[PDB]
Design a protein around this ligand. Structure first.
Ligand SMILES: CCCCCCCCCCCCCCCCCC(=O)OC[C@H](COP(=O)([O-])OCC(O)COP(=O)([O-])OC[C@@H](COC(=O)CCCCCCCCCCCCCCCCC)OC(=O)CCCCCCCCCCCCCCCCC)OC(=O)CCCCCCCCCCCCCCCCC
Ligand SMILES: CCCCCCCCCCCCCCCCCC(=O)OC[C@H](COP(=O)([O-])OCC(O)COP(=O)([O-])OC[C@@H](COC(=O)CCCCCCCCCCCCCCCCC)OC(=O)CCCCCCCCCCCCCCCCC)OC(=O)CCCCCCCCCCCCCCCCC
Ligand SMILES: CCCCCCCCCCCCCCCCCC(=O)OC[C@H](COP(=O)([O-])OCC(O)COP(=O)([O-])OC[C@@H](COC(=O)CCCCCCCCCCCCCCCCC)OC(=O)CCCCCCCCCCCCCCCCC)OC(=O)CCCCCCCCCCCCCCCCC
Ligand SMILES: CCCCCCCCCCCCCCCCCC(=O)OC[C@H](COP(=O)([O-])OCC(O)COP(=O)([O-])OC[C@@H](COC(=O)CCCCCCCCCCCCCCCCC)OC(=O)CCCCCCCCCCCCCCCCC)OC(=O)CCCCCCCCCCCCCCCCC
Ligand SMILES: CCCCCCCCCCCCCCCCC[C@@H](O)O[C@H](CO[C@H](O)CCCCCCCCCCCCCCC)COP(=O)(O)OCC[N+](C)(C)C
Ligand SMILES: CCCCCCCC/C=C\CCCCCCCC(=O)OC[C@H](COP(=O)(O)OCCN)OC(=O)CCCCCCC/C=C\CCCCCCCC
Ligand SMILES: CCCCCCCCCCCCCCCCCC(=O)OC[C@H](COP(=O)(O)OCCN)OC(=O)CCCCCCCCCCCCCCCCC
Ligand SMILES: CCCCCCCCCCCCCCCCCC(=O)OC[C@H](COP(=O)(O)OCCN)OC(=O)CCCCCCCCCCCCCCCCC
Ligand SMILES: Nc1ncnc2c1ncn2[C@@H]1O[C@H](COP(=O)(O)OP(=O)(O)O)[C@@H](O)[C@H]1O
Lengths: 321, 347, 459, 121, 98, 49
């Protein structure tokens, strides 16, 4: 043992034995600038679950090396502020941002599943890979991205998200678009103040017409308004009194759980199909730029060698490690 | 598949091959072949998908036909001699049946199609085990029955294997199909030297196994199954591409790399027996194998193909699983030419 | 020979362990020291060779080639440090490693005492060269050039391997001394004809022979400066050395089998000089000049007289030095203007005086100007060919005239005339470039002073 | 199979008792040193693949690589030398026992041997 | 050799030709594969009974055992192919190419 | 502390280090003894010393 694998499995570590029937995956969803973050915080703290804030850019930075984020040129090469300012850029920033955000959400979902399977403690994600496509549809129907971008996104999403268990609970916070705009104006951030009304309507249409009907068949779906979402006590009470046996989690066994844990503990296999040789001009990076940026990344302080073997960050006994 | 079931199936495959290699009885040799095939099918079908199912179906059909022909040869040999011991076969018809059956098991031309088809169908681990072990066993049987092999038939099949491997590898783009055609060509070389020096056959087998293990494990490490997927490896782990380049150069037979030693020794041995046309043709035809190795090496290491944007996240993360004996295989497949006279120890 | 082999294998760890800014200094200094040490091999005997051990031996034919290789390494280092300024430290060290490996293989190739060890080493020299070309070349055609070079050489050399193992089975040994003492005449039969063809064709492709030479323009044009320097200076001399070695056992069949190769060499010498007359690319012009000179050397080896062998050796050394110098000069011009076209840059004599002097000296040596060793070798080959037949003088005279024509045409086009008006980035010549040209040219004149050191064993 | 099935051959025996009469390889053998070099190269490649400092990290692992390679190389050299000695022994015995097949020949000097001269001109 | 051995060998050859020439169904090929082992069983027992090789009488039973092991393997592969494609046709096994 | 997560190779596995050093030392001393025994047996069999 000493590391999960086939040896640990034949020794007898079993996920079903580890779980305590309170191990649930709960994902909170909503339109832009809703109370989903605070609702997720409340649910995670009341149920004793681990909270996962929405995976923006630099989530991979937060989970690797030191927690501090990296330069945007080295982590993402995309800008949400620039997307708000000039959505129809000529450098493909919109779809670069969308693909990077999908990869980050996939990585966060893998981390959450690994934590749940290795600990048995439930997790509350502020968004999942199953809700990421709504922003893609909003971009596409507004003309920000292209049909080729949509097709590449669909291919990667297929071959990646087909291998993971869906959330137990999907909590959707329904807020009207004018209220969304009023809250955005009150917040006062200029970049999100540049958001148009047609963009916000497309996200709501994608949630209502595709995501909620799709996830209603799998397991339980709970919808709340702003007032209902404000009172998190009733939401946690509703979660605690959910009866469901039609999900894939009951159908899972120890062998399937072993396979899933082996998949999710290996982050490079998680991201394996995120870099497929589909040469969209938006995401494709030339040989010279790739070489220069990779050289810079290796020149980063604790990135040249493996984590235990970086002398400049204060690792000793390297000659015996 | 449960880990215990997988390891017992692997143990059963190895037990079948060992039964083949230790048995002195034709019935026990056939039993070993049957046990190997029976335990090998689920290993192919481990990762369930229609391609794996089709590959396993084709593999089963081919190996079952070969086993039927081999048992027919055994019975015919028993009819004319009443002997069960595996020695020189006493009937030429039985010997021809046995030769064709073992060639079909090995994948020698014109019984080669199933090799690229199955290799493309199955995963990288399954292909590695297939190529290595399933070449290992029938070659042992052939070495035991070598003294009655029809040189004309054996050399015809070997030369066909070399030509077909070169041409198929020229056309292919998928890495698993490239490896399959490489295997076909190397089997051709081994069986070409087989009627003269079983020691040279064994030496070629060992060098080929080392090179194939190194190459397949590098492909598993980089998680590349196509040429373009391998073209992105320079941006994540550039050392793997350099090692793959030197291994590919070795597999093409370039001196002073390890892949030159089997070709050199086989040519020498064949020329000792007054064979010149066959060694010259065999040496010249390997240039096709070298061409598609070089074409694969241009994309992976010697040139920098465009990369994507999520390769940055891949940079941020580190490889977890450790390949067993990969550095040893890489060294043995490139730097053992000065240790050539150890083939006497192999004798 | 270990006192020269081991310091190269120590150049390897030193290069890999030195600091990021000391790699060029260390490599250059210790390469020069190794060259100085290898100068001691020129003290040869009049009777036999220097038999160091059972594995390595040195002769009057091997010694100058070894000295040329060891002297050529630091010049390649200087040119490489010119054009590889922005490379990473690991890739600089890999480049130096490829150069060091190539030098080690060449040294052991020239000093090998068995034909099979010679074959293994002279085929091992392909891998560093191919990697250098196809990895550090500038243009797109480097990949096709590497493929052409590799497959031409291997298609030539594989029948040589078969013939060598056959000869060992037949006679008992491939040791050069044994096969020289136990040589027997080769009867006129089809089997002997094809053995002769296998060996000779391997080395003729390596030479190259006219009609088997396209890989040479392809590879020399598209390789980096170090690759071009080593390809022309040394790697073309493996074919000549091999032919001067193997023809011991091919007599008397060489008297009858040399006609197609002699006719090909003479006519192709004329043809490649004429091609040089009408070349729009400077590197291609230099490459075809190399083809012409090596055709002359092939003629010398095939006629196979004591006066021709001395000429062959002298011409090989002289061509190595001259072609290396010409490639370096063309590369400096290319680094100025980032193009290989000959008529793009002109007036370089009024913009760069000392480089004009270097161009004049190199072009004068490229044509046979007395008393340079180029002329010594060419004159010996011409005299031996005249004793062979009396129309070879006609062909040689035509070749000399065209050689002078294209050499002076290249000089006049590049240097004289009026400067191109819009080319305003022609900075003054560097001390490094001037020192490189001086180190190319001064040893040639010293060899002219002492010519018995490069005339081979037949002297 | 030339030397397989040789009389008195114990199966599955890496080194028989009759090999103890040969000189063992010297520990400073060039072939043993090359085996050690291969082990060191394997250790360096292991460090490079695992992305540790190539020459610094894992000194114990590199030492184990070198030691294992030298151990197996020593035994391999012993077996190789024994097999070659066996081949020479068998060849000499056969030549001794078949004089009609390997007859001594009268040696003629080059003064008595006639060889054709082919001029080069 | 008597004509009986000729008939048995001819039957084996007919069954071998049947297997190598597919028509549409994979099941028919499996039936041809089972017939080959029946002919092998008959031939081996005819040879053994005639020479009174007493200890060899157990060989045909082992032959039958591995025969039905192969039949089991083929039936399992056939059910997987049928589940994937809807029919046991050999034309559907064409995803992989040479 | 620099890494947000403890690296798997944070501190040397002293069990593995001890096993590695012990295995190397055992193999070396065994090889020396084997070579000495081989030399003695060779000399005894050939009647040299
Ligand atoms: C009986 C007593 C021993 C039992 C040992 C196993 C039980 C304990 C461990 C355990 O639970 O293992 C489960 C584990 C299965 O766990 P899993 O999560 O299903 O992993 C699936 C894949 O292995 C996941 O893929 P992977 O990346 O883990 O691949 C592992 C494996 C995949 O490859 C194989 O399994 C093939 C192994 C044979 C390779 C060919 C060797 C050819 C040698 C020719 C002759 C040379 C002389 O090996 C390789 O990839 C490289 C193999 C290099 C072999 C070098 C041999 C040199 C001699 O079993 C194995 O990994 C294989 C066990 C094989 C046992 C037989 C003896 C070997
Ligand atoms: C095509 C027309 C033709 O025959 O052109 C010959 C002609 C050779 O010059 P030549 O002055 O007419 O030859 C003198 C006598 O005719 C022939 O000389 P000889 O009658 O005094 O006896 C010597 C003859 C003894 O005769 C034989 O050995 C004939 C038996 C078959 C020889 C097969 C040669 C295979 C090896 C070379 C493969 C590549 C070509 O030697 C050869 O045949 C030498 C064979 C190799 C010739 C040159 C190979 C390099 C060609 C480079 C350009 C390729 C484009 O041109 C070529 O061979 C190259 C162009 C055609 C290809
Ligand atoms: C790093 C490794 C070295 C560390 C420093 C030395 C530690 C050990 C000191 C020690 O015990 O010294 C006593 C021992 C003295 O031996 P001895 O008992 O006096 O010799 C008398 C013998 O009874 C009889 O001696 P012999 O003259 O008859 O030798 C027979 C020889 C006859 O062999 C031949 O005639 C043919 C030899 C070549 C065959 C293959 C050619 C084609 C392949 C080329 C290479 C491909 C891969 C690249 O066959 C062999 O030696 C079989 C193996 C062939 C290769 C031998 C290589 C020895 C050095 C091992 C390390 C090489 C590293 C190279 C790269 C370095 C990078 C930093 O010294 C050595 O063995 C030291 C050798 C030199 C070490 C420094 C590296 C030189 C590399 C030269 C490469 C070119 C040649
Ligand atoms: C040293 C001479 C060797 C001669 C040949 C012998 C056989 C090979 C040697 C054994 C293996 C060595 C290690 C291989 C991996 C190295 C990776 C690396 O970065 O290394 C840098 C490493 C130091 O860097 P670091 O800070 O640790 O980490 C930097 C990162 O790795 C930086 O990582 P990165 O991400 O920047 O890496 C990117 C780089 C990564 O590139 C590489 O990793 C290239 C090197 C590995 C490629 C495969 C190596 C050969 C494997 C066997 C194949 C056959 C070899 C023979 C082939 C002959 C025909 C060519 O990729 C590229 O640059 C791609 C573009 C180029 C691709 C095309 C060219 C490929 C050439 C392949 C053949 C090279 C053969 C010569 C060996 C060159 C390396 C030593 O330096 C060395 O390992 C130097 C060698 C060891 C020196 C030991 C000195 C001990 C003390 C003194 C002893 C004195 C003598 C003893 C007697 C006592 C006297 C008193
Ligand atoms: C009192 C009791 C004491 C007992 C002491 C032990 C006695 C020996 C026990 C051996 C181990 C037990 C059996 C386990 C398997 C044994 C395998 C090996 O020992 O057997 C030998 C086999 O040894 C190996 O063949 C030699 C291995 C050589 C490895 C290198 C190959 C050379 C490659 C060339 C380049 C080398 C590059 C450098 C390599 C690192 C000889 O067996 P043999 O019955 O006769 O083989 C029959 C088959 N033949 C006839 C066709 C050959
Ligand atoms: C298409 C047509 C190709 C024609 C070119 C030939 C290249 C293909 C090589 C195939 C072999 C053809 C020639 C075979 C010659 C041969 O085997 O005999 C040579 C002789 C045989 O003697 P024995 O068999 O012992 O007879 C005993 C008599 N009592 O053996 C030898 O001397 C060794 C010769 C090695 C074979 C050489 C074959 C190659 C000949 C030159 C071609 C190479 C040219 C290089 C190509 C570069 C330019 C394209
Ligand atoms: C530390 C890092 C790992 C590398 C370790 C390298 C050394 C390994 C061996 C240690 C010494 C073992 C020993 O005792 O060897 C002695 C033995 C010769 O002794 P013996 O023959 O009995 O006496 C002479 C008789 N005339 O010697 C032998 O038998 C020699 C066999 C081994 C040959 C090895 C060849 C060199 C390998 C590369 C070494 C590079 C070291 C670089 C270290 C860098 C550290 C930063
Ligand atoms: C006959 C045995 C064959 C090998 C069996 C074991 C194979 C699996 C183990 C090696 C896996 C790859 C190497 C890298 C391991 C990285 C993990 C690590 O830290 O390993 C530490 C380990 C030393 O730990 P330790 O448990 O002490 O090992 C000795 C046994 N007590 O350090 C190591 O393991 C590194 C050194 C391993 C030994 C040298 C490499 C193997 C080759 C030995 C010489 C034979 C060469 C020819 C091989 C083919 C022909 C037999
Ligand atoms: N797939 C996506 N594409 C583009 N922008 C996204 C995507 N996912 C999230 N975002 C941006 O990230 C931010 C998420 O925060 P938000 O949903 O507003 O909650 P809060 O109100 O707590 O900030 C929003 O500004 C949104 O525009």
């Amino acid at each position: 043992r000493l590391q999960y694998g086939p040896l640990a499995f034949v020794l007898g570590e079993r996920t079903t034995r580890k779980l305590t029937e309170t191990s649930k995956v709960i994902t909170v969803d909503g339109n832009i600038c809703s109370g989903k973050g605070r609702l997720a915080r409340e649910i995670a703290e009341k149920l004793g679950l681990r909270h996962f804030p929405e995976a923006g850019i630099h989530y991979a930075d937060s989970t690797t090396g030191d927690g501090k984020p990296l330069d945007v040129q080295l982590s993402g090469n995309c800008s949400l502020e620039k997307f708000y300012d000039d959505p129809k850029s000529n450098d493909g920033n919109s779809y670069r941002l969308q693909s990077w955000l999908y990869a980050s959400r996939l990585l966060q979902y893998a981390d959450a599943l690994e934590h749940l399977l290795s600990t048995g403690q439930g997790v509350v994600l502020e968004r999942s890979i199953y809700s990421d496509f709504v922003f893609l549809e909003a971009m596409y129907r507004q003309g920000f991205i292209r049909k080729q971008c949509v097709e590449h996104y669909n291919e990667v999403k297929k071959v990646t998200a087909c291998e993971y268990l869906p959330p137990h609970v999907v909590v959707y916070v329904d807020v009207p678009v004018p209220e969304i705009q009023s809250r955005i104006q009150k917040k006062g951030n200029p970049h999100e103040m540049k958001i148009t009304a047609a963009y916000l309507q497309d996200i709501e249409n994608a949630y209502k017409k595709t995501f909620l009907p799709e996830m209603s068949e799998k397991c339980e779906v709970l919808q709340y308004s702003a007032r209902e979402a404000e009172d998190a006590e009733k939401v946690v009470e509703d979660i605690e009194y959910l009866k469901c046996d039609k999900g894939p989690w009951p159908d899972q066994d120890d062998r399937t759980f072993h396979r899933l844990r082996m998949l999710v503990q290996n982050k490079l296999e998680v991201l394996n199909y995120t870099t497929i040789p589909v040469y969209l001009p938006e995401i494709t990076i030339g040989a010279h730029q790739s070489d220069r940026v990779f050289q810079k990344f290796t020149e980063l302080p604790g990135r040249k060698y493996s984590p235990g073997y970086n002398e400049d960050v204060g690792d000793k006994w390297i000659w015996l490690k | 598949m449960n880990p215990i079931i997988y390891t017992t199936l692997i143990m059963t495959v190895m037990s079948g091959t060992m039964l083949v290699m230790i048995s002195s009885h034709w019935l026990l040799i056939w039993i070993g072949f049957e046990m190997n095939l029976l335990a090998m099918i689920p290993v192919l079908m481990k990762n369930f998908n229609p391609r794996a199912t089709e590959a396993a179906t084709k593999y089963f059909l081919t190996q079952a036909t070969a086993s039927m022909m081999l048992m027919m040869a055994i019975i015919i040999n028993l009819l004319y001699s009443g002997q069960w011991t595996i020695t020189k076969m006493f009937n030429p018809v039985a010997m021809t049946m046995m030769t064709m059956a073992l060639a079909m098991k090995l994948g020698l031309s014109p019984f080669h199609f199933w090799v690229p088809e199955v290799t493309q169908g199955i995963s990288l681990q399954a292909g590695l085990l297939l190529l290595t072990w399933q070449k290992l066993a029938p070659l042992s049987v052939l070495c035991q029955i070598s003294q009655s092999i029809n040189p004309n038939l054996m050399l015809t099949m070997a030369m066909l294997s070399i030509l077909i491997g070169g041409w198929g590898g020229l056309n292919q783009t998928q890495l698993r199909k490239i490896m399959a055609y490489s295997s076909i060509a190397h089997m051709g070389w081994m069986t070409a030297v087989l009627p003269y020096n079983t020691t040279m056959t064994i030496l070629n087998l060992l060098i080929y196994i080392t090179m194939t293990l190194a190459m397949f494990m590098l492909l598993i490490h980089s998680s590349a199954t196509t040429t373009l997927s391998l073209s992105h490896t320079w941006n994540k782990m550039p050392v793997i591409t350099s090692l793959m380049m030197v291994t590919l150069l070795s597999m093409g037979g370039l001196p002073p790399l390890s892949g030159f030693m089997p070709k050199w020794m086989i040519i020498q041995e064949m020329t000792k027996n007054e064979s010149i046309i066959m060694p010259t043709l065999m040496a010249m035809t390997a240039l096709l194998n070298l061409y598609f190795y070089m074409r694969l090496a241009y994309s992976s290491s010697l040139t920098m193909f465009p990369s994507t944007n999520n390769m940055k996240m891949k940079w941020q993360f580190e490889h977890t699983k450790q390949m067993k004996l990969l550095p040893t295989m890489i060294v043995l497949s490139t730097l053992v030419l000065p240790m050539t006279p150890a083939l006497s120890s192999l004798n | 020979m270990l006192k020269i082999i081991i310091p190269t294998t120590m150049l390897l760890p030193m290069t890999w362990m030195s600091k990021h800014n000391m790699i060029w200094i260390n490599a250059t200094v210790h390469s020069l020291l190794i060259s100085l040490i290898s100068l001691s091999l020129l003290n040869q005997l009049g009777e036999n060779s220097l038999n160091f051990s059972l594995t390595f031996f040195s002769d009057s034919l091997s010694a100058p080639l070894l000295v040329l290789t060891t002297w050529l390494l630091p010049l390649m280092l200087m040119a490489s440090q010119s054009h590889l300024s922005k490379e990473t430290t690991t890739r600089k060290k890999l480049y130096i490693t490829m150069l060091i490996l190539l030098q080690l293989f060449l040294i052991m190739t020239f000093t090998a005492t068995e034909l099979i060890l010679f074959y293994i080493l002279f085929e091992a020299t392909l891998v560093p060269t191919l990697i250098i070309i196809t990895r550090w070349g500038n243009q797109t055609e480097r990949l096709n050039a590497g493929l052409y070079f590799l497959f031409y050489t291997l298609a030539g050399s594989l029948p040589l391997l078969v013939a060598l193992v056959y000869i060992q089975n037949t006679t008992g040994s491939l040791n050069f001394l044994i096969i020289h003492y136990w040589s027997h005449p080769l009867s006129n039969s089809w089997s002997n004809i094809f053995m002769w063809l296998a060996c000779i064709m391997a080395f003729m492709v390596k030479m190259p022979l006219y009609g088997l030479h396209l890989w040479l323009p392809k590879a020399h044009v598209e390789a980096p400066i170090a690759g071009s320097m080593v390809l022309a200076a040394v790697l073309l001399k493996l074919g000549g050395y091999g032919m001067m070695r193997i023809t011991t056992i091919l007599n008397p069949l060489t008297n009858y089998m040399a006609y197609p190769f002699l006719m090909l060499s003479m006519w192709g010498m004329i043809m490649t000089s004429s091609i040089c007359l009408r070349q729009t690319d400077l590197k291609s012009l230099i490459a075809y000049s190399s083809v012409s000179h090596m055709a002359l050397v092939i003629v010398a080896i095939m006629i196979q007289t004591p006066w021709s062998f001395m000429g062959a050796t002298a011409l090989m050394i002289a061509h190595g030095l001259t072609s290396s110098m010409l490639f370096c000069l063309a590369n400096t011009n290319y680094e100025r203007v980032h193009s290989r076209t000959m008529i793009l840059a002109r007036g370089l004599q009024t913009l760069l005086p000392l480089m004009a002097t270097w161009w004049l000296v190199a072009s004068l040596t490229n044509l046979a100007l007395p008393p340079s060793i180029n002329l010594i070798g060419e004159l010996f080959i011409i005299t031996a060919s005249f004793s062979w037949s009396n129309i070879t003088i006609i062909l040689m005279g035509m070749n000399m005239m065209i050689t002078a024509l294209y050499s002076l045409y290249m000089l006049i086009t590049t240097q004289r005339g009026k400067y191109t008006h819009h080319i305003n980035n022609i900075k003054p010549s560097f001390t490094r470039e001037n020192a490189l040209m001086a180190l190319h040219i001064l040893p040639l004149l010293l060899l002219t002073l002492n010519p018995k050191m490069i005339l081979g064993p037949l002297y | 199979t030339m030397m397989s099935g040789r009389p008195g051959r114990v199966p599955l025996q890496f080194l028989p008792n009759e090999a103890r009469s040969l000189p063992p390889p010297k520990l400073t053998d060039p072939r043993l040193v090359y085996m050690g070099f291969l082990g060191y190269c394997s250790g360096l490649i292991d460090n490079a693949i695992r992305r540790r400092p190539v020459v610094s990290a894992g000194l114990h692992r590199q030492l184990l690589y070198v030691t294992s390679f030298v151990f197996f190389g020593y035994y391999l050299l012993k077996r190789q030398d024994y097999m070659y000695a066996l081949r020479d022994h068998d060849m000499f015995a056969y030549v001794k026992s078949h004089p009609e097949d390997f007859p001594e020949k009268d040696k003629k000097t080059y003064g008595e041997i006639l060889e054709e001269f082919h001029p080069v001109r | 050799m008597p004509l009986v051995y000729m008939n048995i060998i001819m039957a084996f050859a007919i069954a071998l030709a049947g297997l190598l020439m597919y028509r549409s169904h994979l099941m028919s090929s499996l039936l041809c594969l089972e017939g080959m082992m029946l002919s092998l069983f008959i031939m081996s027992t005819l040879i053994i009974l005639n020479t009174h090789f007493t200890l060899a009488n157990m060989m045909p039973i082992i032959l039958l055992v591995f025969a039905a092991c192969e039949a089991a393997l083929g039936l399992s592969l056939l059910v997987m192919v049928s589940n994937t494609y809807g029919t046991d046709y050999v034309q559907n096994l064409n995803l992989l190419q040479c | 502390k620099f890494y947000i997560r403890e690296p798997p190779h944070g501190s040397p596995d002293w069990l593995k280090v001890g096993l590695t050093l012990g295995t190397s030392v055992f193999l070396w001393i065994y090889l020396i003894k084997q070579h000495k025994e081989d030399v003695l047996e060779y000399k005894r069999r050939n009647g040299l010393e």
